[PDB]
Amino acid sequence: NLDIIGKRIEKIKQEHETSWHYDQDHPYKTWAYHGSYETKQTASSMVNGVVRLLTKPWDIIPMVTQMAMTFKEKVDTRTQEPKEGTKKLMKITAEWLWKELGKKKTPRMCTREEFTRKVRSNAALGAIFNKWKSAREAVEDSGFWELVDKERNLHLEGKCETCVYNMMSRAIWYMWLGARFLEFEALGFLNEDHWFSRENSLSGVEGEGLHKLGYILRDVSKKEGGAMYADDTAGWDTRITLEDLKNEEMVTNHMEGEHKKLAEAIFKLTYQNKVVRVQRPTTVMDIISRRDQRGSGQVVTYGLNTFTNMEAQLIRQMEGEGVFKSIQHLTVTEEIAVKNWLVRVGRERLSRMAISGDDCVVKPLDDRFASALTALNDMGKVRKDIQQWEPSRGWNDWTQVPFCSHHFHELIMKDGRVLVVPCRNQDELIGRARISQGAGWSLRETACLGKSYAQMWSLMYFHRRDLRLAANAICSAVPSHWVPTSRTTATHEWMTTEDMLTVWNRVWIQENPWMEDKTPVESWEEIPYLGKREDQWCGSLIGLTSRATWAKNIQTAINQVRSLIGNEEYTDYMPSMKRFRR
Ligand SMILES: [Zn+2]
Ligand SMILES: [Zn+2]
Ligand nearest to the CA of 178: 1
Binding site annotation covers 232?
Answer: yes
Buried b (16+ CB within 10 A) or exposed e, 177-189: bbbbbbbbbbbbb
Dist. CA 58–CA 416, nearest whole Å: 34
Q: How was this structure determined?
A: X-ray
- Angle, to 10 degrees, between the axis of helix 142-156 and the axis of helix 177-187? 60
CA dihedral 420, 421, 425, 428 (to 10 degrees): 150
Structure resolution in Å?
A: 1.7
Binding site annotation covers 160?
Answer: yes
Buried b (16+ CB within 10 A) or exposed e, 300-334: bbbbbbbbbbbbbbbbbbbbbbebbeebeebeeeb
Q: Where are the beta strands (DSSP E) in 413-549?
A: 418-423, 435-437
* Ion ligand 2, residues whose Cβ is below 5 A away: 423, 538
Binding site annotation covers 236?
Answer: yes
Burial of 553 (0-12, 13-18, 19+ CB in 10 A): exposed
**Ligand 1 center–CA 143 separation, angstroms:** 17
Q: What are phi and psi of 111, to 5 degrees?
A: -110, 150
Name beta bridge partners: 359.
Answer: 356
**Ligand 2 center–CA 521 separation, angstroms:** 23
Ligand nearest to the CA of 464: 2
Positive or negative CA dihedral for 23, 27, 30, 36?
negative
- Write out the DSSP string of 271-327: ISSEEEEEEE---EEEEEEESSS--S-HHHHHHHHHHHHHHHHHHHHHHHTTS-S-S
Whether the Cβ atoms of residue 95 and residue 307 lie closer than 8 Å to each other: no
**Ligand 2 center–CA 289 separation, angstroms:** 44
**Ligand 1 center–CA 9 separation, angstroms:** 12
Kindly report the number of other CB atoms within 10 A of residue 532's CB atom: 12
**Ligand 1 center–CA 271 separation, angstroms:** 11
Binding site annotation covers 3?
Answer: no
Binding site annotation covers 235?
Answer: yes
The DSSP element (H or E) to which 329 belongs, if any, is none
Ligand nearest to the CA of 425: 2
Q: What are phi and psi of 375, to 5 degrees?
A: -65, -45
**Ligand 2 center–CA 425 separation, angstroms:** 7
Positive or negative CA dihedral for 551, 67, 134, 138?
negative
Dist. CA 110–CA 297, nearest whole Å: 15
**Ligand 1 center–CA 293 separation, angstroms:** 18
Binding site annotation covers 516?
Answer: no
Residue of 70, 72, 76, 40 lying closest to 281 (CA atoms): 40
**Ligand 1 center–CA 40 separation, angstroms:** 26
Name beta bridge partners: 537.
Answer: none
Name beta bridge partners: 288.
Answer: 33, 276
**Ligand 2 center–CA 461 separation, angstroms:** 10
Task: Kindly give the residue spans of alpha helices, DSSP state H, lying in 379-414.
Answer: none
**Ligand 2 center–CA 407 separation, angstroms:** 6
Binding site annotation covers 233?
Answer: yes
Kindly report the number of other CB atoms within 10 A of residue 515's CB atom: 16
* DSSP letter assigned to residue 93: H
The DSSP element (H or E) to which 379 belongs, if any, is none
**Ligand 2 center–CA 472 separation, angstroms:** 21
Dist. CA 82–CA 474, nearest whole Å: 53
List, in order, residues 6 or more apart from 209 with CB less than 8 Å away: 490, 491, 493, 507
Residue of 360, 69, 72 lying closest to 232 (CA atoms): 360
Residue of 345, 181, 337, 315 lying closest to 243 (CA atoms): 315
Binding site annotation covers 425?
Answer: no
CA contacts within 13 A on the Cβ side of 390: 9
Ligand nearest to the CA of 274: 1
Ligand nearest to the CA of 533: 2
Dist. CA 329–CA 149, nearest whole Å: 46
Binding site annotation covers 170?
Answer: yes
Binding site annotation covers 26?
Answer: no
Dist. CA 204–CA 404, nearest whole Å: 12
CA contacts within 13 A on the Cβ side of 252: 19
**Ligand 1 center–CA 87 separation, angstroms:** 29
**Ligand 2 center–CA 65 separation, angstroms:** 21
Binding site annotation covers 34?
Answer: no
The DSSP element (H or E) to which 542 belongs, if any, is none
> According to the 3-state scheme, what is the secondary structure of 224-245?
CCCCEECCCECCHHHHCCHHHH
Whether the Cβ atoms of residue 575 and residue 558 lie closer than 8 Å to each other: no
Dist. CA 235–CA 237, nearest whole Å: 6
Burial of 106 (0-12, 13-18, 19+ CB in 10 A): exposed
Dist. CA 270–CA 221, nearest whole Å: 40
